[PDB]
Amino acid sequence: AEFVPPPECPVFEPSWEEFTDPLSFIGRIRPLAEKTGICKIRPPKDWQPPFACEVKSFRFTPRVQRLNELEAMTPREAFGFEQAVREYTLQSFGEMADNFKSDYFNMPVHMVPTELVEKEFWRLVSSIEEDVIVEYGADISSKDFGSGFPVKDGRRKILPEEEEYALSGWNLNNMPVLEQSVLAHINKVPWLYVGMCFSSFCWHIEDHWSYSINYLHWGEPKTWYGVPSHAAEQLEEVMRELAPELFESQPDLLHQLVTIMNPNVLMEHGVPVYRTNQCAGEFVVTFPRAYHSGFNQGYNFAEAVNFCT
């Protein structure tokens, strides 16, 4: 009945020598990590970049997420107007996020086990008797208020001890993003995610089957699920069988907007699924054509970008 957590994805703790070049390190761990779709990378203990976003002016209107919107398809009066719209600052969103989680679980936010949030999230996704609605500060461009990493673009002050992180190859602004093609000779910045408890992203792969790298700057963990690329067709077949028939004929780019599926359903159909809790200061790398999904344990701040090799 209750959710069965998938097996854990690989976690790498590179030494300072191995941490010199990201693409070199990802290329070496590839024989294992590409068989799990996702992997987690813990930087050395003394690698701690500062938070370089413009906090005072950081404002956004998050998207409203109804956890059980797909199950509800199986209409309500005045549908399409369920939730009033709120604009937040970073502070007011965190106050809302902490108040929501502490009130939902009736305990301090840091005392809620990650396994309980995970079990409750997937129960609410399939629940028709309880309509839980959360908000997600998703797809906030790093050009709006700056990246979470320090950037030497002469827009915000950089301290001498912070210049190492502005020049680091693990700075998401310094990842290679230019794909090779003939059209590139004839003729992208990171995105930010401000999460709260139960805010989520559904199953998808990246454009051009690209790699992606994800960094959690601060906050409560982000729970991930990943499927290796050799099982990509198996996942799409399970979707074709069990996803809502009204969305069956939709192209992949549109279907991926609502490809919500319990990982146990995929595992029951023979699809290998791996999980991880990405904590503050840790990287998550997704490999080409590796389907991934997840949700946030609480108030946190993430940065993500697609990169090419």
Interface residues with ligand DKS (CB under 6 A) are: 136, 138-139, 191, 193, 201-202, 204, 214, 222, 302, 304
Please report how close the Cβ of residue 163 comes to ligand DKS at its closest, in angstroms: 28
Residues annotated in a binding site: 136, 204, 206, 212, 214, 222, 292
User: Which one, 2 or 139, has the nearer CB to ligand DKS?
Assistant: 139
Q: Classify 295 as helix, strand or coil.
A: strand
User: Which one, 25 or 211, has the nearer CB to ligand DKS?
Assistant: 211
Please report how close the Cβ of residue 164 comes to ligand DKS at its closest, in angstroms: 26
User: How far apart (Å, rounded) are the C-alpha atoms in residues 282 and 263?
Assistant: 23
User: Which one, 12 or 215, has the nearer CB to ligand DKS?
Assistant: 215
Long-range contacts of 238-242, Cβ-Cβ distance < 8 Å, separation of 24 or more: 238/265, 238/266, 238/269, 238/271, 239/203, 241/269
Residues annotated in a binding site for 2-oxoglutarate: 136, 212, 214, 222
User: Which one, 158 or 294, has the nearer CB to ligand DKS?
Assistant: 294
The b-or-e profile of 275-304 (16+ CB within 10 A means b, else e) is bbbbbeebbbbbbbbbbbbbbbbbbbbbbb
Residues annotated in a binding site for Fe cation: 204, 206, 292
The b-or-e profile of 134-145 (16+ CB within 10 A means b, else e) is bbbbbebebeeb
User: Which one, 158 or 243, has the nearer CB to ligand DKS?
Assistant: 243
User: Which one, 28 or 250, has the nearer CB to ligand DKS?
Assistant: 250
Please report how close the Cβ of residue 295 comes to ligand DKS at its closest, in angstroms: 9
Please report how close the Cβ of residue 141 comes to ligand DKS at its closest, in angstroms: 8
Sheet strands (E) in the chain: 11-12, 38-41, 59-60, 63-66, 88-89, 133-141, 191-195, 200-204, 211-219, 222-226, 274-278, 283-286, 292-296, 300-307
Please report how close the Cβ of residue 306 comes to ligand DKS at its closest, in angstroms: 8
Residue by residue, DSSP assigns 182-216 as: HHHHH----EEEEE-TT-EEEEE--GGG-EEEEEE
Please report how close the Cβ of residue 235 comes to ligand DKS at its closest, in angstroms: 15
230: phi then psi, degrees, rounded to nearest 5: -70, -10
